[PDB]
Short mmCIF file of C-alpha atoms and ligand atoms in Angstrom, two decimals:
data_model
loop_
_atom_site.label_atom_id
_atom_site.label_comp_id
_atom_site.label_asym_id
_atom_site.label_seq_id
_atom_site.Cartn_x
_atom_site.Cartn_y
_atom_site.Cartn_z
CA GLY A 1 114.53 111.32 128.37
CA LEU A 2 112.12 108.71 127.03
CA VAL A 3 109.49 106.86 129.05
CA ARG A 4 109.16 103.11 128.55
CA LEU A 5 105.61 101.80 128.41
CA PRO A 6 104.44 98.18 128.04
CA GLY A 7 102.91 97.05 124.75
CA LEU A 8 99.52 98.81 124.47
CA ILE A 9 96.35 97.01 123.40
CA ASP A 10 93.44 98.42 121.34
CA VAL A 11 90.36 96.22 121.77
CA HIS A 12 88.29 97.96 119.06
CA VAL A 13 89.63 98.49 115.54
CA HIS A 14 88.28 98.09 112.01
CA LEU A 15 90.98 96.86 109.61
CA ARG A 16 88.60 96.50 106.61
CA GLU A 17 90.11 93.31 105.16
CA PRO A 18 88.42 91.35 103.62
CA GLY A 19 86.42 93.50 101.24
CA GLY A 20 87.14 97.14 102.06
CA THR A 21 90.84 97.30 101.37
CA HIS A 22 90.77 100.76 99.70
CA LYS A 23 89.90 102.05 103.19
CA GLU A 24 92.58 100.07 105.10
CA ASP A 25 94.04 96.59 105.11
CA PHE A 26 95.78 94.48 107.75
CA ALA A 27 99.18 95.77 106.64
CA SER A 28 98.29 99.47 106.64
CA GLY A 29 96.06 99.38 109.72
CA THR A 30 98.67 97.55 111.80
CA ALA A 31 101.36 99.99 110.59
CA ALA A 32 99.04 102.71 111.95
CA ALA A 33 98.73 100.76 115.22
CA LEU A 34 102.51 100.48 115.71
CA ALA A 35 102.98 104.19 114.92
CA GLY A 36 100.39 104.84 117.66
CA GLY A 37 102.29 102.71 120.22
CA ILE A 38 99.81 99.82 119.91
CA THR A 39 101.26 96.30 119.74
CA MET A 40 98.06 94.21 119.81
CA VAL A 41 94.65 94.90 118.23
CA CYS A 42 91.23 93.25 118.32
CA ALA A 43 89.59 93.52 114.88
CA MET A 44 85.85 93.89 114.42
CA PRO A 45 83.81 91.53 112.21
CA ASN A 46 81.83 93.96 109.97
CA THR A 47 83.95 93.13 106.90
CA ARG A 48 82.90 91.85 103.47
CA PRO A 49 82.24 88.95 103.87
CA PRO A 50 81.50 89.56 107.59
CA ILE A 51 83.15 87.29 110.16
CA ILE A 52 79.96 85.43 111.15
CA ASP A 53 80.81 81.73 110.72
CA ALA A 54 83.73 79.33 110.72
CA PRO A 55 84.62 79.68 106.99
CA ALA A 56 84.73 83.47 107.21
CA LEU A 57 86.86 83.31 110.36
CA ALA A 58 89.28 80.90 108.65
CA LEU A 59 89.65 83.31 105.72
CA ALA A 60 90.17 86.32 107.99
CA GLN A 61 92.75 84.43 110.11
CA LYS A 62 94.88 83.74 107.04
CA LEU A 63 94.57 87.27 105.71
CA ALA A 64 95.60 88.63 109.10
CA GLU A 65 98.48 86.17 109.56
CA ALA A 66 99.82 87.26 106.15
CA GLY A 67 99.22 91.00 106.46
CA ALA A 68 99.37 92.03 110.12
CA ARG A 69 102.54 93.71 111.43
CA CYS A 70 101.44 93.65 115.09
CA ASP A 71 99.71 90.88 117.02
CA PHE A 72 95.93 90.50 116.91
CA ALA A 73 92.73 88.70 117.82
CA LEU A 74 89.64 88.59 115.57
CA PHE A 75 86.06 89.11 116.78
CA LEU A 76 83.13 87.01 115.58
CA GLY A 77 79.87 88.83 114.81
CA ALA A 78 76.36 87.95 115.91
CA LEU A 79 73.55 87.70 113.38
CA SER A 80 69.83 87.19 113.80
CA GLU A 81 70.18 83.52 112.73
CA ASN A 82 73.67 82.34 113.80
CA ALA A 83 73.08 81.83 117.53
CA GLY A 84 74.04 78.34 118.55
CA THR A 85 76.35 77.79 115.55
CA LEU A 86 79.64 79.30 116.77
CA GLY A 87 80.57 76.88 119.54
CA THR A 88 83.40 75.08 117.73
CA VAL A 89 85.22 78.32 116.83
CA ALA A 90 84.21 80.66 119.69
CA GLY A 91 87.38 80.06 121.71
CA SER A 92 89.53 81.09 118.73
CA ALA A 93 87.98 84.58 118.59
CA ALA A 94 88.62 87.75 120.59
CA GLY A 95 84.96 87.58 121.60
CA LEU A 96 81.47 88.00 120.12
CA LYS A 97 80.36 91.46 118.87
CA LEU A 98 76.68 92.44 118.91
CA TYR A 99 75.54 95.36 116.75
CA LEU A 100 72.39 96.66 118.51
CA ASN A 101 71.93 100.06 116.81
CA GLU A 102 72.24 101.57 113.30
CA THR A 103 75.89 102.03 112.23
CA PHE A 104 78.34 100.99 109.50
CA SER A 105 77.31 97.30 109.69
CA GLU A 106 75.03 94.77 107.99
CA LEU A 107 74.77 92.81 111.29
CA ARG A 108 72.00 94.52 113.26
CA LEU A 109 69.90 92.09 115.37
CA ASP A 110 66.11 92.42 114.78
CA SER A 111 64.74 91.37 118.17
CA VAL A 112 65.86 91.31 121.80
CA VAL A 113 65.00 87.59 121.68
CA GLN A 114 68.00 87.14 119.36
CA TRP A 115 70.19 88.98 121.88
CA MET A 116 68.98 86.50 124.51
CA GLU A 117 69.70 83.55 122.21
CA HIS A 118 73.29 84.72 121.74
CA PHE A 119 73.83 85.31 125.47
CA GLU A 120 72.42 81.80 126.18
CA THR A 121 74.46 79.93 123.52
CA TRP A 122 77.83 81.72 123.32
CA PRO A 123 80.22 80.04 125.82
CA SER A 124 79.75 81.73 129.19
CA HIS A 125 83.51 82.16 129.84
CA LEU A 126 84.17 84.10 126.60
CA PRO A 127 83.78 87.87 126.05
CA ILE A 128 80.66 89.54 124.66
CA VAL A 129 80.92 93.16 123.53
CA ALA A 130 78.07 95.38 122.33
CA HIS A 131 77.45 98.46 120.23
CA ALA A 132 74.67 99.70 122.55
CA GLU A 133 73.73 103.40 122.65
CA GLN A 134 71.49 105.30 125.13
CA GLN A 135 68.64 103.08 126.33
CA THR A 136 70.20 100.11 124.51
CA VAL A 137 72.87 100.05 127.24
CA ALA A 138 70.14 99.41 129.81
CA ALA A 139 68.44 96.85 127.54
CA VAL A 140 71.60 94.78 126.94
CA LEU A 141 72.43 94.93 130.67
CA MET A 142 68.99 93.44 131.33
CA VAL A 143 69.66 90.59 128.90
CA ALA A 144 73.05 89.96 130.57
CA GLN A 145 71.33 89.72 133.98
CA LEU A 146 68.61 87.40 132.74
CA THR A 147 71.32 85.11 131.40
CA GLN A 148 73.60 85.63 134.53
CA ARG A 149 76.77 86.79 132.76
CA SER A 150 78.97 89.80 131.95
CA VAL A 151 78.91 92.29 129.07
CA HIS A 152 81.33 94.94 127.78
CA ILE A 153 79.94 98.19 126.32
CA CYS A 154 81.78 99.57 123.27
CA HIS A 155 82.51 103.29 122.66
CA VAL A 156 80.56 104.95 125.49
CA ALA A 157 79.90 108.53 124.40
CA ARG A 158 77.22 110.16 126.57
CA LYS A 159 76.58 111.35 130.11
CA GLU A 160 73.42 109.18 130.07
CA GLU A 161 75.41 106.04 129.24
CA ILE A 162 78.29 106.52 131.68
CA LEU A 163 75.88 107.28 134.58
CA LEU A 164 73.81 104.18 133.83
CA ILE A 165 76.99 102.06 133.81
CA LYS A 166 78.08 103.76 137.05
CA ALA A 167 74.75 102.82 138.68
CA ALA A 168 75.08 99.22 137.48
CA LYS A 169 78.61 98.91 138.91
CA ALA A 170 77.37 100.31 142.23
CA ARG A 171 74.91 97.37 142.32
CA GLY A 172 77.77 94.92 141.70
CA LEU A 173 76.74 93.99 138.17
CA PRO A 174 79.44 92.51 135.87
CA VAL A 175 79.73 95.24 133.24
CA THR A 176 82.80 96.94 131.78
CA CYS A 177 83.14 99.67 129.18
CA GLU A 178 85.48 101.54 126.89
CA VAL A 179 85.68 105.15 125.62
CA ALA A 180 87.12 106.35 122.30
CA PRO A 181 89.31 109.45 121.98
CA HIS A 182 86.90 111.40 119.80
CA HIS A 183 84.30 111.31 122.64
CA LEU A 184 86.90 112.77 125.04
CA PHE A 185 88.49 115.37 122.72
CA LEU A 186 85.76 116.42 120.24
CA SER A 187 82.18 117.60 120.70
CA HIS A 188 79.28 119.33 118.96
CA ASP A 189 81.45 122.46 118.96
CA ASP A 190 83.67 120.80 116.32
CA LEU A 191 80.87 120.04 113.83
CA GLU A 192 81.09 123.46 112.11
CA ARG A 193 84.76 122.85 111.30
CA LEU A 194 84.33 119.17 110.37
CA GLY A 195 81.15 119.60 108.33
CA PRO A 196 78.31 117.09 108.10
CA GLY A 197 80.14 114.33 106.21
CA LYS A 198 83.47 114.19 108.01
CA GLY A 199 81.59 114.65 111.29
CA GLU A 200 79.47 111.49 110.86
CA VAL A 201 80.32 108.87 113.50
CA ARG A 202 78.44 106.48 115.75
CA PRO A 203 77.85 107.20 118.53
CA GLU A 204 77.59 110.76 117.29
CA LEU A 205 79.73 113.49 118.80
CA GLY A 206 78.36 114.59 122.15
CA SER A 207 77.64 117.89 123.83
CA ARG A 208 80.20 119.65 126.02
CA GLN A 209 78.24 118.24 128.96
CA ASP A 210 78.66 114.68 127.61
CA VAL A 211 82.43 115.17 127.24
CA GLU A 212 82.70 116.69 130.74
CA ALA A 213 80.71 113.77 132.20
CA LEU A 214 83.09 111.18 130.72
CA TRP A 215 86.11 112.99 132.20
CA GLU A 216 84.37 113.43 135.59
CA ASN A 217 83.54 109.71 135.57
CA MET A 218 86.98 108.42 134.52
CA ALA A 219 86.83 105.91 137.37
CA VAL A 220 83.93 104.17 135.57
CA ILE A 221 85.86 103.83 132.27
CA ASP A 222 87.70 100.48 132.15
CA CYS A 223 89.43 100.84 128.74
CA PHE A 224 90.30 103.35 126.04
CA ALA A 225 89.88 101.96 122.54
CA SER A 226 90.10 103.89 119.30
CA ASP A 227 87.18 102.47 117.30
CA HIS A 228 89.56 103.07 114.39
CA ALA A 229 86.99 103.21 111.57
CA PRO A 230 88.75 104.26 108.37
CA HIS A 231 86.89 105.46 105.29
CA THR A 232 88.38 107.55 102.50
CA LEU A 233 87.84 111.31 102.28
CA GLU A 234 85.80 110.82 99.07
CA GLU A 235 83.46 108.50 100.99
CA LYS A 236 83.22 110.81 104.02
CA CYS A 237 82.36 113.79 101.80
CA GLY A 238 80.09 112.07 99.27
CA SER A 239 76.33 111.74 99.07
CA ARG A 240 75.86 109.00 101.71
CA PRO A 241 78.78 109.36 104.12
CA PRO A 242 79.59 106.31 106.21
CA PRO A 243 80.08 106.95 109.92
CA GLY A 244 83.48 106.54 111.52
CA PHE A 245 86.84 108.14 112.25
CA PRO A 246 90.39 106.78 111.86
CA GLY A 247 92.17 106.93 115.21
CA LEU A 248 95.09 104.54 115.78
CA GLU A 249 97.77 107.13 115.01
CA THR A 250 96.24 109.93 117.10
CA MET A 251 94.94 108.12 120.22
CA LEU A 252 98.12 107.90 122.30
CA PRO A 253 99.35 111.43 121.41
CA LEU A 254 95.97 112.88 122.48
CA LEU A 255 95.99 110.93 125.75
CA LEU A 256 99.64 111.77 126.53
CA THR A 257 98.73 115.45 126.10
CA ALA A 258 96.02 114.99 128.73
CA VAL A 259 98.51 113.26 131.05
CA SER A 260 100.92 116.20 130.62
CA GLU A 261 98.08 118.57 131.58
CA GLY A 262 97.27 116.57 134.73
CA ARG A 263 93.83 115.45 133.49
CA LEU A 264 94.69 111.82 134.27
CA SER A 265 97.84 110.04 135.44
CA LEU A 266 100.24 107.82 133.51
CA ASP A 267 98.92 104.90 135.56
CA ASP A 268 95.32 105.81 134.68
CA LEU A 269 96.36 105.61 131.02
CA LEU A 270 98.16 102.27 131.39
CA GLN A 271 95.26 100.65 133.24
CA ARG A 272 93.01 101.63 130.33
CA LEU A 273 95.36 100.76 127.41
CA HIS A 274 97.14 97.70 128.86
CA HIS A 275 96.01 96.03 132.11
CA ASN A 276 92.22 96.22 131.79
CA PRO A 277 92.21 95.15 128.09
CA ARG A 278 94.32 92.15 129.09
CA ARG A 279 92.04 91.11 131.94
CA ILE A 280 88.66 91.71 130.28
CA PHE A 281 89.58 89.90 127.06
CA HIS A 282 92.04 87.36 128.55
CA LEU A 283 94.76 88.54 126.21
CA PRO A 284 98.26 87.15 126.75
CA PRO A 285 101.44 89.07 127.53
CA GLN A 286 103.82 89.89 124.68
CA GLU A 287 107.40 88.92 125.57
CA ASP A 288 110.18 91.47 124.94
CA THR A 289 107.67 94.16 123.89
CA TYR A 290 107.63 97.86 124.83
CA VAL A 291 106.96 101.38 123.58
CA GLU A 292 109.24 104.38 124.14
CA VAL A 293 107.53 107.79 124.16
CA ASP A 294 108.80 111.40 124.27
CA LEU A 295 106.53 113.47 126.51
CA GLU A 296 108.16 116.83 125.71
CA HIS A 297 107.69 117.11 121.95
CA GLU A 298 104.95 119.54 120.88
CA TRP A 299 103.35 119.18 117.46
CA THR A 300 100.13 119.92 115.58
CA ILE A 301 98.06 117.11 114.08
CA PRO A 302 98.24 117.41 110.23
CA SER A 303 95.49 116.87 107.65
CA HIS A 304 96.34 113.15 107.45
CA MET A 305 98.54 110.82 109.48
CA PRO A 306 101.22 108.85 107.60
CA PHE A 307 99.85 105.26 107.64
CA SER A 308 96.08 104.86 107.63
CA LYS A 309 94.61 104.60 104.14
CA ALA A 310 91.73 106.81 105.32
CA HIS A 311 94.10 109.71 104.50
CA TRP A 312 92.23 112.23 106.70
CA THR A 313 91.68 112.88 110.41
CA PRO A 314 89.04 114.76 112.45
CA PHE A 315 91.76 115.92 114.87
CA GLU A 316 93.54 118.08 112.27
CA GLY A 317 94.83 121.26 113.88
CA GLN A 318 94.83 120.07 117.49
CA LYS A 319 98.03 120.75 119.41
CA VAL A 320 99.46 117.70 121.19
CA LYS A 321 102.44 117.04 123.45
CA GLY A 322 103.78 113.49 123.33
CA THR A 323 105.00 111.23 120.53
CA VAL A 324 105.86 107.59 119.94
CA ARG A 325 109.59 107.27 119.27
CA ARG A 326 110.23 103.53 119.20
CA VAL A 327 108.30 100.24 119.44
CA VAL A 328 109.91 96.84 120.04
CA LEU A 329 107.63 93.83 119.38
CA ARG A 330 108.76 90.37 120.51
CA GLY A 331 112.42 91.36 120.39
CA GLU A 332 112.41 93.12 116.99
CA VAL A 333 112.41 96.85 116.31
CA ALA A 334 108.95 97.45 114.83
CA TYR A 335 108.78 101.27 114.54
CA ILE A 336 111.20 104.18 114.83
CA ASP A 337 110.35 107.84 114.27
CA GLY A 338 107.95 107.35 111.40
CA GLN A 339 109.47 104.20 109.88
CA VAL A 340 107.82 100.78 110.27
CA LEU A 341 110.49 98.07 110.32
CA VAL A 342 108.54 94.80 110.51
CA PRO A 343 106.94 93.41 107.34
CA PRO A 344 103.36 92.36 106.70
CA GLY A 345 103.01 88.94 108.28
CA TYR A 346 105.18 89.55 111.34
CA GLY A 347 102.07 89.72 113.52
CA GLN A 348 100.44 86.65 115.05
CA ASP A 349 97.01 85.50 116.27
CA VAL A 350 97.32 85.63 120.06
CA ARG A 351 94.44 83.16 120.49
CA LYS A 352 96.72 80.45 119.04
CA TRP A 353 99.38 81.00 121.72
CA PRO A 354 99.09 78.56 124.65
CA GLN A 355 98.88 81.50 127.03
CA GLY A 356 96.16 83.14 124.87
CA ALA A 357 93.45 80.52 125.35
CA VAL A 358 90.72 81.58 127.77
CA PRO A 359 90.64 79.28 130.83
CA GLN A 360 87.46 77.25 131.33
CA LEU A 361 86.05 74.54 133.52
CA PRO A 362 86.18 71.02 131.97
N1 NCD B 401 81.66 103.91 114.76
C1 NCD B 401 81.40 104.18 113.44
O1 NCD B 401 80.89 105.26 113.17
N2 NCD B 401 81.71 103.28 112.49
C2 NCD B 401 82.28 101.96 112.68
C3 NCD B 401 81.30 100.99 113.25
C4 NCD B 401 81.00 101.01 114.79
O2 NCD B 401 81.95 101.00 115.64
O3 NCD B 401 79.78 101.11 115.12
C5 NCD B 401 82.84 101.48 111.27
O4 NCD B 401 83.09 100.26 111.15
O5 NCD B 401 82.95 102.33 110.35
ZN1 ZN B 402 80.05 100.53 117.08
ZN1 ZN B 403 84.29 97.74 121.39
ZN1 ZN B 404 83.56 99.90 115.78
ZN1 ZN B 405 101.80 97.85 134.96
#
């Protein structure tokens, strides 16, 4: 007895093309998405070249249209000197990403004044998302208030962060957030097994109290998003390990296991992987699109999942209950039981669909 789910949406993935294609490309990363029950992804802009102007966006659009197997939208990235220059292309992007802390990015902003300049110049009806850890969450919320608009907080990982967001929502402030599976299912207790290279991620893995606080405050979490951040094992275990975990192929199995245990409901999962992504990012429906899952099948996560070029996973050894059996995307069988059945290039840029433009006042 399979359960039919709508097409799930991951609003935070790194597909590494252009410029990091040994780690992942559009074709391999979207294969990983489909195998994880994800039919639409929003790809981050910290590529090489980074997606920080109209020419880079045009390149990335063509690479994605040629390589993606599922549908997508592409983020633009903020830089210290590109505020006020993105207006002609802003509506074609998923949103604008701000990198406000140290991480795997060359995009960090130098001054809160540059955050203000972006919030003032980026069109007010279009999404802004931020990598903002600890007190940076409070700082970016202040900038959003000064400029009288909303903000979405990426990968919330700490008790401190979720309680600050909770307090802001209680005051009626327009803030949303997402949580990644590693911050729900891994902690400091896993660092001995992972070791110091594999364990590198931003935000870093939290304490048991951080993990417990995210679960206790599920009502505050608007979305789940993988922050799929593939790097090869050689890179993770070398002299200067980059932070990040692959996650597309493991996210839905981990969350289905939690549903089976009664830790959240099926509806709670679908709000966070379908309805709230749609409404926060103004992403369009996908016609004739659904995911069939088997909630009974028990399995153990192996040392690498089949599709991601990262070829490793921090969830190795965890026992899960739930698997993706079939995905149909826009009327075509896209995935069955380990086989991807749509070619590179089947996926489309949802921002080019009439229904994928963000409504605005004239
Ligand atoms: N989270 C990470 O540790 N790494 C991400 C970047 C990010 O989401 O900050 C990556 O692109 O590798
Ligand atoms: Zn980040
Ligand atoms: Zn994000
Ligand atoms: Zn990221
Ligand atoms: Zn529904």
